[PDB]
Amino acid sequence: AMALRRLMKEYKELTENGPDGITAGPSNEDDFFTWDCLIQGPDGTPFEGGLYPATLKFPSDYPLGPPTLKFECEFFHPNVYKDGTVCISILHAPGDDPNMYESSSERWSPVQSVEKILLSVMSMLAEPNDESGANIDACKMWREDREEYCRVVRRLARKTLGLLVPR
Amino acid sequence: NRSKLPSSKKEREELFRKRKEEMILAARKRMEGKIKGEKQDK
Ligand SMILES: [Mg+2]
Ligand code: NA
């Protein structure tokens, strides 16, 4: 009961007053706990011009626990696992994965929100978090050969956008 | 964002579909302009 009420409230807020660059919501309201997202790559980054599909999966006791977030396309970023799972501190309650994130980083709580999650993803795309390495190849390249990192990201962004069609 | 959330499931689902479509079509249109710039250079 509480989770569906809260998810509807966030969906309404995102639809009516959400940030530019984000579309997110339940495409099928008979599965309200699965949201499709489209995330626009931030301007001024090698992700500029990319448009990235992602899935949010909410637990049945939301907002008491965080959703998971996965990109649904090939993705090359230090904080995104090769399977698409996004590694950011806001998706973990305090105490979970202490070796991965700065302790100054925001953690999951019931007053966090989908909008905050997705704004945090945008921020991570522009500025990777150097403590929470998830993709070792992208971590190395971003730190030691940023020009080549940008080249990889741009090439993948064009490739996956070419595979993105409305459905 | 700028549409009021509709009052029925089917209307909400259609509005969301349309919003995704619009975002995808705009991104593909931007990329087409970038590609044409590059194809010109070759
Ligand atoms: Mg449907
Ligand atoms: Na569901």
Numbering used by the authors:
A (entry chain A): 4 to 170
B (entry chain B): 173 to 214
Paper text:
Cells protect against this through pathways that include ER-associated degradation (ERAD), a process in which incorrectly folded proteins are ubiquitylated, marking them for extraction and subsequent degradation by the proteasome. ERAD requires specific E2 and E3 enzymes, including a conserved soluble E2: UBE2G2 (humans) or Ubc7 (Saccharomyces cerevisiae). These E2s are recruited to the ER by membrane-embedded proteins. Here, we identify the putative E2BR domain in S. pombe Cue4 and present a 1.7 Å resolution co-crystal structure of this E2BR in complex with S. pombe Ubc7.
The peak was pooled, concentrated and subjected to sparse-matrix crystallization screening. After refining the crystallization conditions, a crystal was grown that diffracted to 1.7 Å resolution in space group P212121 with a single complex in the asymmetric unit. The C-terminal end of S. pombe U7BR continues as a helix until residue 213, making it the longest contiguous helix of the three E2BRs. Human G2BR and S. pombe U7BR diverge at residue 180 of S. pombe U7BR (residue 574 of G2BR), where human G2BR ends and S. pombe U7BR turns towards the H2 face of Ubc7, forming a seven-residue N-terminal extension that lies on top of the H1 helix of Ubc7 and is unique among the three E2BRs. While the H. sapiens and S. cerevisiae E2BR domains used for crystallization were mostly ordered, with only a few residues at the N-terminus of G2BR that did not have sufficient density to be modeled, the longer S. pombe U7BR construct used for crystallization had 22 N-terminal residues that were not observed in electron density. The S. pombe Ubc7–U7BR complex buries a surface area of 2423 Å2 between the E2 and U7BR, as calculated using CNS. Three S. pombe U7BR residues that interact with Ubc7 are structurally and genetically conserved in the two other species: Lys192, Ala199 and Arg200. Superposition of E2–E2BR crystal structures on the structure of a cross-linked Ub E1–E2 complex reveals potential steric clashes between the N-termini of H. sapiens G2BR or S. pombe U7BR and the Ub-fold domain (UFD) of the Ub E1. While S. pombe U7BR appears to interfere with E1–Ubc7 binding, it presents no obvious structural impediment to Ubc7–E3 RING domain binding.
